[PDB]
Design a protein around this ligand. Structure first.
Ligand SMILES: [Cl-]
Ligand SMILES: [Mg+2]
Ligand SMILES: [Mg+2]
Ligand code: NA
Ligand code: NA
Length: 274
DNA sequence: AAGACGTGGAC
DNA sequence: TGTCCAGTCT
């Protein structure tokens, strides 16, 4: 058999993936890839990252862009709050940080859309600085290798082992190896993350509130100035064309109130504008 | 904490 | 080929 760090390093060399956002120095380009990767497959991110970088090449450029343009670029990646939080982070850094991202984990975690994993990822991948980077692939490796016989294991139990095994001067290459080995394990054995205490599944997407959330934002993006009642008519048309029934008035008004509060579009009179 | 929050790639 | 599943925030 093989000790843990040697299994990871050798597997990482065997499995290395030459992804476009790897081995970059620009923390902003790395941040965009990491936000895009949250709960989203590498192959999808590959279809968006280069295009997004071309349209918004810097923190300052993303800050200056219209929110509608950023949302348009995001459509299809899902979990669209990420687009707003990423743009907000750019706006904060443009106005307060001279157009640059911070270079400590704590300061990165203070920014919208950047939790512990994205913060550690930016520090490791952009700055080659060590930290605890625990996402689905790393979780899978540690569950498979160090918790082989355990039915359910919390991230609390994994955290000290991820911390202890991160090399001081090689974090970027180490976490690429964990990412690549984890994705491999997810293909060749029963997904080890099923033994995570936090393993869950979402509600049915068809007919769901979040399906309507995403449609409503697309309808407003497509039609600046759309009236509030017209928006309801168009949502109902989409639902019926998809085979579902009309949306009840309470649900329509509640979802729209949520989307305005979150910043996807604004109300001007009775009309909506992204 | 648990649970809200998209949707397309792999099999 | 319908099912599984690829972090942040409160
Ligand atoms: Cl729902
Ligand atoms: Mg944050
Ligand atoms: Mg589904
Ligand atoms: Na713009
Ligand atoms: Na598998």
């Amino acid at each position: 058999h093989m000790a843990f760090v040697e299994r990871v390093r050798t597997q990482g060399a065997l499995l290395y993936r030459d992804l476009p956002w790897r081995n970059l120095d620009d923390p902003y380009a790395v941040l965009v890839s990491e936000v895009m990767l949250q709960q989203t497959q590498v192959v999808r991110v590959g279809k968006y990252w280069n295009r997004f970088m071309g349209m918004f090449p810097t923190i300052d450029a993303l800050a200056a862009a219209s929110t509608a343009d950023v949302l348009a670029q995001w459509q299809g990646l899902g979990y669209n709050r990420r687009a707003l939080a990423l743009k907000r982070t750019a706006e904060v850094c443009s106005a307060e940080r001279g157009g640059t991202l911070p270079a400590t984990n704590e300061e990165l975690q203070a920014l919208p859309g950047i939790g512990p994993a994205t913060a550690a990822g930016v520090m490791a991948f952009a700055y080659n600085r060590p930290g605890v980077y625990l996402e689905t692939n790393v979780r899978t490796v540690f569950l498979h290798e160090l918790f082989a016989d355990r039915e359910k294991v919390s991230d609390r139990e994994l955290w000290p082992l991820v911390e202890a095994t991160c090399p001081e001067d090689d974090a970027r290459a180490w976490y690429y190896a964990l990412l690549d080995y984890g994705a491999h394990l997810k293909a060749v054995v029963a997904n080890p993350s099923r033994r995570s205490a936090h393993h869950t599944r979402q509600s049915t997407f068809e007919g769901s509130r979040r399906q309507k959330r995403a449609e409503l934002v697309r309808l407003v993006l497509a039609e600046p100035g759309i009236g509030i009642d017209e928006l309801a008519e168009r949502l109902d048309a989409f639902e019926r064309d998809a085979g579902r029934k009309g949306v009840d008035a309470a649900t329509f008004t509640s979802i729209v109130a949520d989307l305005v509060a979150e910043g996807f579009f604004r109300r001007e009179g009775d009309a909506f504008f992204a």
